[PDB]
Amino acid sequence: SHMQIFVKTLTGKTITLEVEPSDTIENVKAKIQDKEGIPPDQQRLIFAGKQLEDGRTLSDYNIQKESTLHLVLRLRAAMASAARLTMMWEEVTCPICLDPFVEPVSIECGHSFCQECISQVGKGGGSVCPVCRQRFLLKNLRPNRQLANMVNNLKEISQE
Amino acid sequence: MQIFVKTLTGKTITLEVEPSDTIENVKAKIQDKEGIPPDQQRLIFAGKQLEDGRTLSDYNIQKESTLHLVLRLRGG
Amino acid sequence: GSQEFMAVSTGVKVPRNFRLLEELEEGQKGVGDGTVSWGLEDDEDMTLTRWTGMIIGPPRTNYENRIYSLKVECGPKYPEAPPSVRFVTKINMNGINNSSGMVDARSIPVLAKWQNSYSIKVVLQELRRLMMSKENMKLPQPPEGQTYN
Amino acid sequence: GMAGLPRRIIKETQRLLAEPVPGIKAEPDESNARYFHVVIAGPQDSPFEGGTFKLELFLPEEYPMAAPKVRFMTKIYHPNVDKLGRIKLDILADKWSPALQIRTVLLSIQALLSAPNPDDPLANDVAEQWKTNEAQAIETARAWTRLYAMNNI
Ligand SMILES: [Zn+2]
Ligand SMILES: [Zn+2]
């Protein structure tokens, strides 16, 4: 039997979830991922002066119907360093697909994209750079393998 | 002084400026870090599109003020 | 199971307002032959609900030279639900209640078997092509210039 | 029937909820993840200051290779905005970049409010007034802002 609870963000947004007393805290973070797009790694749930652990249930924490939870985003402060490790993912993020680079290549201006992402932009042999609008030709695509090695390094870091 | 600047993808970068430094002065530091020419940069603060002439304190940009970067645009 | 894998998926869900904004632009751009025209009744209605259409009578018919103004209303379920259609200029055509201008969606296929692929332009173009048919091509018409109220 | 929403749209939606921009609000519709309901604040030091302007935004099937569709849902006095809220802005057409996002599109729209262009207009009747007497047009934009864009949420 599903029940309703509320998860309010510090921004002001309130979320309504259909949950069960037997749901673990990680089950709720998955329901938050499907509805809000936020991955479970970046979720820290709060209820009644306690931080909640993924292995325990809503019933363990006396979370009944119409209970209000507080969602905090990336509350914790480090995996190496919170903000700095985040900056490393952003440097290897494709500006087009917003995912980590897949076969990263550079164009004339020096900006780098996924090979397939920039190839779609330059259908016909060329276009303008999405970041700086300088003209580029697909024949001058240049592999940027250090960015790809950086992606796997960070992916290994994520899974320890 | 220190200012945050949110780039096109959303990545935030820190910069070294002065209250007296012009807007194009900030664009140069953005160009060195991000490779966007100043003529294609548009910096937004409080919704108003900053003109290259004036200074940071002409817009009351204190420290840890977050600017937002946008591409060159024109109404038509 | 109830669902199966499909390799290709196209046609995202376009909100009602943006579908209506597209139909507004085509009517403003004069797209088509010129025998039909469509647009908003009040150009401040942000809901894009109340529309007004035009239809020129076809040649080789009884409606030749006759300009017909129409009013169309796209409800909150458009373009899934069909729109209400009406006639501003009094007319004699099979499938329309004779003292109203309201269109019997039953007696017109485009509104009876309604799709989401159908636009207001088609409801007007096929209504003029419906007026081309044999039965109403020889129907007697009232004095042009008289309307309902 | 159903297909996966593109990851870029998932990412943009999650970062609109996690890192909001001051003066800009964007929220997806419950029935359509490509449909966004927007409120932007009028730019400082403009006749639109203090106003809250409602917009709706749609991500078409070709996004981000194509620009988002966006229009005002609030009446506004602007030469590049017609009376139904449609906007003529170059980054929404020929000057679109797939590196632009909902966040930077909305920031560019309020940048358009701070830089109206009556020389290349969408609403020619509004622009003719902006060119005849710009001081009166700015006052009218300020009056329209209080009439339609205050206490409207
Ligand atoms: Zn990519
Ligand atoms: Zn570039």
Residue numbers in the entry:
A (entry chain B): -1 to 158
B (entry chain D): 1 to 76
C (entry chain A): -4 to 144
D (entry chain C): 0 to 152
Provide text from the study.
Ubiquitin chains that are linked via lysine 63 (K63) are involved in endocytosis, DNA damage, and the immune response. The only E2 enzyme dedicated to K63-ubiquitination is Ube2N (Ubc13), which forms a heterodimer with either Ube2V2 (Mms2) or Ube2V1 (Uev1). Ube2V2 binds and orients the acceptor ubiquitin, thereby generating specificity for K63 linkage. TRIM21 detects antibody-coated viruses by specifically recognizing the bound antibody.
In crystallization trials, we used N-terminally mono-ubiquitinated TRIM21 RING domain (UbG75/76A-TRIM211–85 or Ub-R), an isopeptide-linked, non-hydrolyzable ubiquitin-charged Ube2N conjugate (Ube2N~Ub) and Ube2V2. We solved the atomic structure of this complex at 2.2 Å resolution, with one copy each of Ub-R, Ube2N~Ub and Ube2V2 in the asymmetric unit. The naturally occurring TRIM21 RING homodimer was generated in our model by invoking crystal symmetry. The Ube2N-charged ubiquitin can be found in the RING-promoted closed Ube2N~Ub conformation and thus represents the donor ubiquitin. The RING-bound ubiquitin of a symmetry-related complex was captured by Ube2N/Ube2V2, positioning its nucleophilic K63 NζH3 group 4.8 Å from the electrophilic carbonyl of the donor ubiquitin C-terminus. Interestingly, K63 of this acceptor ubiquitin shows a direct interaction with D119 of Ube2N. This suggests that D119 deprotonates K63 on the acceptor ubiquitin, thereby activating it for nucleophilic attack. In our crystal structure, one RING dimer is positioned so as to mediate the elongation of another mono-ubiquitinated RING in trans. Importantly, this mechanism depends only on binding of the RING-anchored acceptor ubiquitin to Ube2N/Ube2V2, as no contacts with the RING itself could be observed in our crystal structure. In our structure, it is clear that initiation of TRIM21-anchored chain elongation cannot occur in cis, as the priming ubiquitin cannot reach the Ube2N/Ube2V2 binding surface.
